RNA sequence: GAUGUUAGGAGGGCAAAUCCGCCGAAUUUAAGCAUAUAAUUAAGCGGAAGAAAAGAAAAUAACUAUGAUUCCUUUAGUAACGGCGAGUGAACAAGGACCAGCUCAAACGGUUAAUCCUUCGUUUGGUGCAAACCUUUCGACGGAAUUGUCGUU
RNA sequence: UAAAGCUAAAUAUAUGUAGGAGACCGAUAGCAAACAAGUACCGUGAGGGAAAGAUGAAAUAGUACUCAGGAAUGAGCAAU
RNA sequence: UUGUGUUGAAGCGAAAUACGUGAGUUUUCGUGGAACAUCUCCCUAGUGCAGAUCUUGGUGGAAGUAGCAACUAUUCAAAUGAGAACUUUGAAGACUGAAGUGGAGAAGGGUUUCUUGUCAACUGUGAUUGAACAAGAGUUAGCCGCUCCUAAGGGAUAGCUGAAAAGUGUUUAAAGGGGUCCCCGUCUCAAAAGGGAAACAGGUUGAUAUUCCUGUGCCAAUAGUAUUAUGAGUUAGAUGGUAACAUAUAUAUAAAUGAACUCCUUUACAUAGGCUUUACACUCGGGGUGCGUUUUCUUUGCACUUUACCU
RNA sequence: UUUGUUUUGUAGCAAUAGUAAUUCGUAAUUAUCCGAAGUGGUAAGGACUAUCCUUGAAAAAAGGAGGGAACGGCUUUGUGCUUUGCUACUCUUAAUACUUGUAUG
RNA sequence: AGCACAGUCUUAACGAUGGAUGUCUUGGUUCCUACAGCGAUGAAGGCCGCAGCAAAAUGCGAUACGCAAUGAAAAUUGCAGUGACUGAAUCAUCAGAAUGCUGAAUGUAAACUACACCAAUUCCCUGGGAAUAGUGGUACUCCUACAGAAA
């Protein structure tokens, strides 16, 4: 039974070949199941979960293999940009919502609101 | 006469007026005029009416699965910046 | 009361003209410099029957003057015209049975 | 838009699930020497032909397809006079 | 009919697959059953 | 003007309890019924937010005067409307909750559009393991704009 | 001081979500739905729309064995 | 406020030398197996049923009654089975009877199909049967259809109205194609009986067949070079016939040059009447292959005798 | 090279496939399978006649034509064109062998 | 071994049918409080699938009754098998990854798993080997810049 870290770093070509033979052996268990045999049948859940684990690691491997080539550049693609809600994405940014004309800015800057005490 | 008002005419009921209505899956898609009687699929609107609260409630939001908003829920409580992951061991 | 038959006639649901077999609208040759300033002769190839009307129609083939080719016109036939004759249209066309002339 | 995960294109491991062990499936091999397999409902004749000719080296006179009521596809494959269909019945089992 | 659409045939197969009873091992621990003659699925 | 399988972006639909426009009845009451009432409601169409809308007097008062809007108590079932029949019906002042006020239009910079936007590279430091994010300004280029942006009230 | 524009507060929330409560109802009641409920089912369709909770402390105690019966079942000097 | 409960509360059935006048109250026994009352005083209400052709549920007399009535009709023997008028087999007697309970048919139905097993309910009688129940299995196409085209027509575009919703669809199309600059040209859907590329025969399964096998064919498609052949025409293109007519039989009759621009034809079309041809259908006698009464007679009553697509 | 007269064939598929009766390991073999017609029941085709104040549908697709932009090659001058030597020629059907995505469906 | 007439009606005891009553309640109802949108970065809704044996409901999306990560922390069990003796069995959290066909649905259509056009696309090692009829894009309206044609 294979785990995450033993194949988490090995050659992707060997990963592909091993998955190829894994699926061929799954088809072999399918030969067995179609035949009168049903004994080798309970480990397919474990093999399926192992495939799922190896594949969510493999797609992350391809993920940095494909995003390191493009990182930053300030024009991220449709998927790689931020995925906030539509209203949040279309909202005015906070700095430019708080931006003020030169008149009000000079008023506040040169003479602000400030606290005090009553005796 | 032989195919009169009742059973005789009922014997002629072959061929259907409505069908599956791919937008809703209900057998209410008029075939001749090509328009759903439950939602009006060719039109972009969903065809509700305020005089039938029963039909409103039996297809309003939440009667389905909510593939997206149910995951989007309980996220304002966390306020996690996107791309963030918990600290490793 | 209810809407009477005469009023229902104008809705055009079943009172549209049964025109599935009509051969085309009966229209004269469209006005042209040639027809305004002289004769142009087109030959009536065949006199046909339009199911809607009683008057037979004539399939007059003219030869277009601005391009190579021929144009076919459906013209209400006058009593006495035959296939194979040339019919003349215009101001300078001689007056005769079937000819189209300025009034 | 760029995709990171490898394509979900249905290769043979996902086209073909298993062959059939129906009495008719064995009977046609025994008598008239035609073979039976089962594939996914989204496959096609030439996809099955590719996958069979890739996994196994048996000449395919033709590939025959069928859409079952359980959501799968049945497939029939052949040989030529070059190959016999008794070892193709014994090796597979 | 002997001629039908792919979606209609798939839905017929789904209904046939749904008409089977509860597994016995699960029962060891259904009410949505239809007869083809009594109740029509209305397609 | 047209056109772009030009570059970068938006609108569509769902969902309505509160909210904003339009359209818009009748049942009913008048012991009948037609104005009236139901009701500026029900139904229908369209449009947003966490609240919306209203909001800074072309206001009220007539006093020793008040000072944006909204809501609560009251004015008050009052003034008034109405086959003056059935019925309908405010506003000011007063007591409170809350309380923030502001900018476009002309003058002038014409001994200098002083403005705005796009794109492309550099850096000013930072919280995150990371991803990202907050800040950073040297610019250059391309434009928009005098058929008027910003500065000035 | 009209015929241009912005503006937070106090205000409303038969919707959704999440909490807390009640001189409320206790399965013909309370939401239509305490349950596999807007489900089964009906109508071409717009739509209409139910019934159905309770062994026992513990089935990790759900009836072993015998007799008679084809079997269902019944009986026991047997049994939790 | 102050009490009853596993030493059995609530509820329920029967009852009481019980109380009241009466709604009722309180006790007894049995059942029940977990809560109950407060009359000390007061507060509160979805607070008291005989009816409303009341609502929901359950159950009666009617009553083992009405009734199990179209479709001429069944009988003998055997098998299976616990059990056979209505399962199977054989015999017989009959029916559908040329416009069929016969094959293929489409809409509609959706696994009712097949095999095996089975009878809790259903199969209005029985039932071992079954279209019931249970487990498996079963539908194979270049040639059969859809897919393509267009009609009655539908939706949409341009606009134009309308608050929108929607109403109409060229009402001042600048709308893709073609060839090599110009010409033509709203889009899309709508026919499993209209038009239409090309398949026949034999055989095969428990269930599919002009789809699977064998054989034989047919139609559509097929990009850039070097070899061949066949036939043509030629050192850029034929034949006779007074005429109509016809004109290339190699593996196949292919071999008689060709743009833009056009003009036709096929597709492509009603009804009635008779005449004619052909295939198929049926039928007749004698030649090749099987049964029969025969008390009374038989050259006796009869029966089985083929050839697709492809020329 | 033509005309007449005799032998072969179920005109070629064609019997051998199918079908049918007796013997026959329990798989087999046999031979037949013919002269002809006669009715007109159903279909289709043909050539006609008649009827309409009824004239009885479109495209997809395919074909034919008028006309004639362009037509024998190798190499060779100058700038698709005049020119010098040899004249072998070119296509219609079928393919064969290597490059294009694998070149049937 | 014998005896009651039968039927109809009444009473009592025990039963049958039925599901009232009482007692239960992971439900409803009402009020209060707080937060509030989702969607071309593809929503709500509808289909189709996904478990060893798997119908519904619930959950999930070809990584399909769940993957990764974090906290708790060793069982899943109906049989099978799976696990530590902790990223391992199961919960909880859930930010990473993935998220089929549709649907405003948006290439043209739709009772079609039909048909287009443009890049043929994608993967492998960091210039060579494969799968392939196989991957993305192409709606309408509008905004800001750009372009080449026009009067």
mmCIF file of N, CA and C (backbone and C1' of nucleotides) in Angstrom, chain I residues 57-89:
data_model
loop_
_atom_site.group_PDB
_atom_site.id
_atom_site.type_symbol
_atom_site.label_atom_id
_atom_site.label_comp_id
_atom_site.label_asym_id
_atom_site.label_seq_id
_atom_site.Cartn_x
_atom_site.Cartn_y
_atom_site.Cartn_z
ATOM 1 P P A I 57 -48.384 20.187 -57.760
ATOM 2 O "O5'" A I 57 -48.062 21.343 -56.711
ATOM 3 C "C5'" A I 57 -47.203 22.426 -57.041
ATOM 4 C "C4'" A I 57 -46.479 22.932 -55.818
ATOM 5 C "C3'" A I 57 -44.963 22.774 -55.844
ATOM 6 O "O3'" A I 57 -44.303 23.858 -56.472
ATOM 7 C "C1'" A I 57 -45.802 21.794 -53.879
ATOM 8 P P A I 58 -42.829 23.660 -57.078
ATOM 9 O "O5'" A I 58 -41.865 23.888 -55.832
ATOM 10 C "C5'" A I 58 -41.787 25.147 -55.179
ATOM 11 C "C4'" A I 58 -40.728 25.130 -54.106
ATOM 12 C "C3'" A I 58 -39.359 24.645 -54.561
ATOM 13 O "O3'" A I 58 -38.562 25.692 -55.089
ATOM 14 C "C1'" A I 58 -40.013 23.448 -52.630
ATOM 15 P P A I 59 -37.278 25.367 -55.998
ATOM 16 O "O5'" A I 59 -36.158 24.914 -54.958
ATOM 17 C "C5'" A I 59 -35.616 25.827 -54.014
ATOM 18 C "C4'" A I 59 -35.023 25.102 -52.831
ATOM 19 C "C3'" A I 59 -33.790 24.260 -53.119
ATOM 20 O "O3'" A I 59 -32.592 25.014 -53.110
ATOM 21 C "C1'" A I 59 -35.349 22.968 -51.909
ATOM 22 P P A I 60 -31.307 24.500 -53.926
ATOM 23 O "O5'" A I 60 -30.759 23.278 -53.062
ATOM 24 C "C5'" A I 60 -30.327 23.465 -51.722
ATOM 25 C "C4'" A I 60 -30.128 22.148 -51.016
ATOM 26 C "C3'" A I 60 -29.195 21.166 -51.702
ATOM 27 O "O3'" A I 60 -27.830 21.447 -51.449
ATOM 28 C "C1'" A I 60 -31.161 20.043 -51.020
ATOM 29 P P A I 61 -26.854 21.867 -52.653
ATOM 30 O "O5'" A I 61 -26.612 20.505 -53.438
ATOM 31 C "C5'" A I 61 -26.278 19.314 -52.742
ATOM 32 C "C4'" A I 61 -26.705 18.096 -53.517
ATOM 33 C "C3'" A I 61 -26.234 18.039 -54.960
ATOM 34 O "O3'" A I 61 -24.904 17.572 -55.084
ATOM 35 C "C1'" A I 61 -28.538 17.541 -54.869
ATOM 36 P P A I 62 -23.948 18.162 -56.231
ATOM 37 O "O5'" A I 62 -24.394 17.369 -57.536
ATOM 38 C "C5'" A I 62 -24.407 15.951 -57.548
ATOM 39 C "C4'" A I 62 -25.206 15.413 -58.706
ATOM 40 C "C3'" A I 62 -24.835 15.947 -60.077
ATOM 41 O "O3'" A I 62 -23.686 15.326 -60.622
ATOM 42 C "C1'" A I 62 -27.179 15.988 -59.831
ATOM 43 P P G I 63 -22.736 16.140 -61.629
ATOM 44 O "O5'" G I 63 -23.520 16.091 -63.013
ATOM 45 C "C5'" G I 63 -23.876 14.849 -63.597
ATOM 46 C "C4'" G I 63 -24.881 15.025 -64.707
ATOM 47 C "C3'" G I 63 -24.472 15.953 -65.837
ATOM 48 O "O3'" G I 63 -23.599 15.342 -66.769
ATOM 49 C "C1'" G I 63 -26.678 16.452 -65.173
ATOM 50 P P G I 64 -22.592 16.247 -67.631
ATOM 51 O "O5'" G I 64 -23.524 16.892 -68.749
ATOM 52 C "C5'" G I 64 -24.253 16.069 -69.644
ATOM 53 C "C4'" G I 64 -25.203 16.876 -70.489
ATOM 54 C "C3'" G I 64 -24.605 18.071 -71.209
ATOM 55 O "O3'" G I 64 -23.880 17.732 -72.375
ATOM 56 C "C1'" G I 64 -26.604 18.727 -70.172
ATOM 57 P P A I 65 -22.566 18.572 -72.758
ATOM 58 O "O5'" A I 65 -23.140 19.968 -73.268
ATOM 59 C "C5'" A I 65 -23.879 20.041 -74.477
ATOM 60 C "C4'" A I 65 -24.801 21.236 -74.518
ATOM 61 C "C3'" A I 65 -24.158 22.572 -74.842
ATOM 62 O "O3'" A I 65 -23.938 22.747 -76.231
ATOM 63 C "C1'" A I 65 -25.616 22.825 -73.001
ATOM 64 P P G I 66 -22.522 23.283 -76.766
ATOM 65 O "O5'" G I 66 -22.720 24.860 -76.865
ATOM 66 C "C5'" G I 66 -23.561 25.429 -77.859
ATOM 67 C "C4'" G I 66 -23.831 26.888 -77.590
ATOM 68 C "C3'" G I 66 -22.604 27.771 -77.423
ATOM 69 O "O3'" G I 66 -22.071 28.200 -78.664
ATOM 70 C "C1'" G I 66 -24.168 28.227 -75.697
ATOM 71 P P G I 67 -20.568 27.820 -79.080
ATOM 72 O "O5'" G I 67 -19.817 29.223 -79.168
ATOM 73 C "C5'" G I 67 -20.477 30.442 -78.853
ATOM 74 C "C4'" G I 67 -19.777 31.164 -77.728
ATOM 75 C "C3'" G I 67 -18.308 30.808 -77.549
ATOM 76 O "O3'" G I 67 -17.486 31.658 -78.330
ATOM 77 C "C1'" G I 67 -19.447 30.743 -75.447
ATOM 78 P P G I 68 -16.310 31.072 -79.251
ATOM 79 O "O5'" G I 68 -14.984 31.494 -78.477
ATOM 80 C "C5'" G I 68 -14.935 32.696 -77.712
ATOM 81 C "C4'" G I 68 -14.346 32.467 -76.341
ATOM 82 C "C3'" G I 68 -12.956 31.841 -76.325
ATOM 83 O "O3'" G I 68 -12.254 32.290 -75.169
ATOM 84 C "C1'" G I 68 -14.476 30.399 -75.239
ATOM 85 P P A I 69 -11.221 33.516 -75.262
ATOM 86 O "O5'" A I 69 -10.963 33.898 -73.738
ATOM 87 C "C5'" A I 69 -9.869 34.719 -73.360
ATOM 88 C "C4'" A I 69 -9.377 34.374 -71.977
ATOM 89 C "C3'" A I 69 -8.196 33.418 -71.908
ATOM 90 O "O3'" A I 69 -6.949 34.054 -72.118
ATOM 91 C "C1'" A I 69 -9.860 32.705 -70.401
ATOM 92 P P A I 70 -5.832 33.357 -73.040
ATOM 93 O "O5'" A I 70 -5.630 31.912 -72.398
ATOM 94 C "C5'" A I 70 -4.424 31.585 -71.723
ATOM 95 C "C4'" A I 70 -4.335 30.118 -71.378
ATOM 96 C "C3'" A I 70 -4.120 29.146 -72.527
ATOM 97 O "O3'" A I 70 -2.803 29.112 -73.045
ATOM 98 C "C1'" A I 70 -5.809 28.307 -71.154
ATOM 99 P P C I 71 -2.565 28.563 -74.539
ATOM 100 O "O5'" C I 71 -2.520 26.979 -74.368
ATOM 101 C "C5'" C I 71 -1.709 26.381 -73.364
ATOM 102 C "C4'" C I 71 -1.907 24.886 -73.285
ATOM 103 C "C3'" C I 71 -1.211 24.074 -74.377
ATOM 104 O "O3'" C I 71 -0.697 22.866 -73.822
ATOM 105 C "C1'" C I 71 -3.530 23.606 -74.393
ATOM 106 P P G I 72 0.887 22.605 -73.810
ATOM 107 O "O5'" G I 72 1.330 22.851 -75.324
ATOM 108 C "C5'" G I 72 0.965 21.952 -76.363
ATOM 109 C "C4'" G I 72 1.875 20.752 -76.390
ATOM 110 C "C3'" G I 72 3.364 21.045 -76.353
ATOM 111 O "O3'" G I 72 3.821 21.339 -75.045
ATOM 112 C "C1'" G I 72 2.903 19.350 -77.948
ATOM 113 P P G I 73 4.824 22.566 -74.785
ATOM 114 O "O5'" G I 73 5.754 22.044 -73.603
ATOM 115 C "C5'" G I 73 5.327 20.991 -72.749
ATOM 116 C "C4'" G I 73 6.389 19.930 -72.620
ATOM 117 C "C3'" G I 73 7.816 20.446 -72.519
ATOM 118 O "O3'" G I 73 8.162 20.803 -71.192
ATOM 119 C "C1'" G I 73 7.709 18.732 -74.146
ATOM 120 P P C I 74 9.356 21.838 -70.914
ATOM 121 O "O5'" C I 74 10.671 20.996 -71.226
ATOM 122 C "C5'" C I 74 11.064 19.915 -70.392
ATOM 123 C "C4'" C I 74 12.437 19.419 -70.766
ATOM 124 C "C3'" C I 74 13.489 20.503 -70.936
ATOM 125 O "O3'" C I 74 14.066 20.888 -69.704
ATOM 126 C "C1'" C I 74 13.551 19.050 -72.797
ATOM 127 P P U I 75 13.867 22.382 -69.154
ATOM 128 O "O5'" U I 75 15.282 23.063 -69.408
ATOM 129 C "C5'" U I 75 16.484 22.330 -69.227
ATOM 130 C "C4'" U I 75 17.508 22.703 -70.267
ATOM 131 C "C3'" U I 75 17.565 24.178 -70.623
ATOM 132 O "O3'" U I 75 18.333 24.928 -69.701
ATOM 133 C "C1'" U I 75 17.548 22.882 -72.604
ATOM 134 P P U I 76 17.940 26.448 -69.371
ATOM 135 O "O5'" U I 76 18.555 27.271 -70.588
ATOM 136 C "C5'" U I 76 19.913 27.105 -70.967
ATOM 137 C "C4'" U I 76 20.141 27.542 -72.391
ATOM 138 C "C3'" U I 76 19.546 28.887 -72.766
ATOM 139 O "O3'" U I 76 20.352 29.973 -72.354
ATOM 140 C "C1'" U I 76 19.009 27.299 -74.431
ATOM 141 P P U I 77 19.777 31.044 -71.306
ATOM 142 O "O5'" U I 77 19.889 32.424 -72.088
ATOM 143 C "C5'" U I 77 21.079 32.773 -72.779
ATOM 144 C "C4'" U I 77 20.845 33.941 -73.697
ATOM 145 C "C3'" U I 77 19.925 35.019 -73.150
ATOM 146 O "O3'" U I 77 20.590 35.918 -72.281
ATOM 147 C "C1'" U I 77 19.257 34.463 -75.343
ATOM 148 P P G I 78 20.166 36.003 -70.733
ATOM 149 O "O5'" G I 78 19.530 37.456 -70.593
ATOM 150 C "C5'" G I 78 20.124 38.573 -71.239
ATOM 151 C "C4'" G I 78 19.116 39.333 -72.062
ATOM 152 C "C3'" G I 78 17.877 39.806 -71.320
ATOM 153 O "O3'" G I 78 18.085 41.002 -70.590
ATOM 154 C "C1'" G I 78 17.216 38.727 -73.300
ATOM 155 P P U I 79 17.582 41.112 -69.067
ATOM 156 O "O5'" U I 79 16.023 41.411 -69.201
ATOM 157 C "C5'" U I 79 15.554 42.455 -70.042
ATOM 158 C "C4'" U I 79 14.104 42.264 -70.407
ATOM 159 C "C3'" U I 79 13.113 42.321 -69.256
ATOM 160 O "O3'" U I 79 12.787 43.645 -68.871
ATOM 161 C "C1'" U I 79 12.632 40.451 -70.619
ATOM 162 O "O5'" G I 80 4.282 31.451 -68.880
ATOM 163 C "C5'" G I 80 3.035 32.059 -69.184
ATOM 164 C "C4'" G I 80 3.204 33.515 -69.540
ATOM 165 C "C3'" G I 80 4.154 33.814 -70.689
ATOM 166 O "O3'" G I 80 3.536 33.661 -71.956
ATOM 167 C "C1'" G I 80 4.609 35.268 -68.872
ATOM 168 P P C I 81 4.141 32.647 -73.048
ATOM 169 O "O5'" C I 81 4.817 33.602 -74.130
ATOM 170 C "C5'" C I 81 4.047 34.552 -74.853
ATOM 171 C "C4'" C I 81 4.886 35.735 -75.266
ATOM 172 C "C3'" C I 81 6.041 35.430 -76.209
ATOM 173 O "O3'" C I 81 5.640 35.357 -77.567
ATOM 174 C "C1'" C I 81 6.822 36.757 -74.418
ATOM 175 P P U I 82 5.883 34.012 -78.412
ATOM 176 O "O5'" U I 82 7.090 34.375 -79.387
ATOM 177 C "C5'" U I 82 6.886 35.190 -80.532
ATOM 178 C "C4'" U I 82 8.195 35.661 -81.115
ATOM 179 C "C3'" U I 82 9.231 34.581 -81.386
ATOM 180 O "O3'" U I 82 9.016 33.912 -82.617
ATOM 181 C "C1'" U I 82 10.251 36.396 -80.260
ATOM 182 P P U I 83 9.284 32.332 -82.746
ATOM 183 O "O5'" U I 83 10.870 32.198 -82.676
ATOM 184 C "C5'" U I 83 11.704 32.809 -83.651
ATOM 185 C "C4'" U I 83 13.136 32.871 -83.182
ATOM 186 C "C3'" U I 83 13.756 31.540 -82.784
ATOM 187 O "O3'" U I 83 14.238 30.801 -83.892
ATOM 188 C "C1'" U I 83 14.169 33.128 -81.089
ATOM 189 P P U I 84 13.647 29.341 -84.209
ATOM 190 O "O5'" U I 84 14.940 28.416 -84.304
ATOM 191 C "C5'" U I 84 16.061 28.808 -85.082
ATOM 192 C "C4'" U I 84 17.354 28.509 -84.367
ATOM 193 C "C3'" U I 84 17.569 27.058 -83.964
ATOM 194 O "O3'" U I 84 18.056 26.256 -85.027
ATOM 195 C "C1'" U I 84 18.051 28.463 -82.128
ATOM 196 P P G I 85 17.169 25.044 -85.600
ATOM 197 O "O5'" G I 85 17.670 23.774 -84.780
ATOM 198 C "C5'" G I 85 18.827 23.055 -85.182
ATOM 199 C "C4'" G I 85 19.083 21.875 -84.279
ATOM 200 C "C3'" G I 85 17.980 20.828 -84.225
ATOM 201 O "O3'" G I 85 18.032 19.910 -85.303
ATOM 202 C "C1'" G I 85 18.623 21.392 -82.029
ATOM 203 P P C I 86 16.681 19.245 -85.864
ATOM 204 O "O5'" C I 86 16.269 18.196 -84.738
ATOM 205 C "C5'" C I 86 17.045 17.028 -84.509
ATOM 206 C "C4'" C I 86 16.602 16.308 -83.261
ATOM 207 C "C3'" C I 86 15.204 15.709 -83.298
ATOM 208 O "O3'" C I 86 15.139 14.467 -83.977
ATOM 209 C "C1'" C I 86 15.482 16.914 -81.288
ATOM 210 P P U I 87 14.288 14.345 -85.335
ATOM 211 O "O5'" U I 87 12.831 14.835 -84.920
ATOM 212 C "C5'" U I 87 11.834 13.910 -84.513
ATOM 213 C "C4'" U I 87 11.340 14.208 -83.121
ATOM 214 C "C3'" U I 87 9.876 13.899 -82.855
ATOM 215 O "O3'" U I 87 9.639 12.529 -82.586
ATOM 216 C "C1'" U I 87 10.388 16.052 -82.028
ATOM 217 O "O5'" A I 88 8.342 7.865 -78.002
ATOM 218 C "C5'" A I 88 9.676 8.345 -78.079
ATOM 219 C "C4'" A I 88 9.723 9.774 -78.558
ATOM 220 C "C3'" A I 88 8.950 10.784 -77.723
ATOM 221 O "O3'" A I 88 9.657 11.217 -76.573
ATOM 222 C "C1'" A I 88 8.436 11.102 -80.001
ATOM 223 P P C I 89 8.856 11.671 -75.255
ATOM 224 O "O5'" C I 89 7.562 12.408 -75.821
ATOM 225 C "C5'" C I 89 6.268 11.885 -75.567
ATOM 226 C "C4'" C I 89 5.185 12.904 -75.816
ATOM 227 C "C3'" C I 89 4.018 12.845 -74.844
ATOM 228 O "O3'" C I 89 4.275 13.609 -73.682
ATOM 229 C "C1'" C I 89 3.203 12.910 -77.072
#
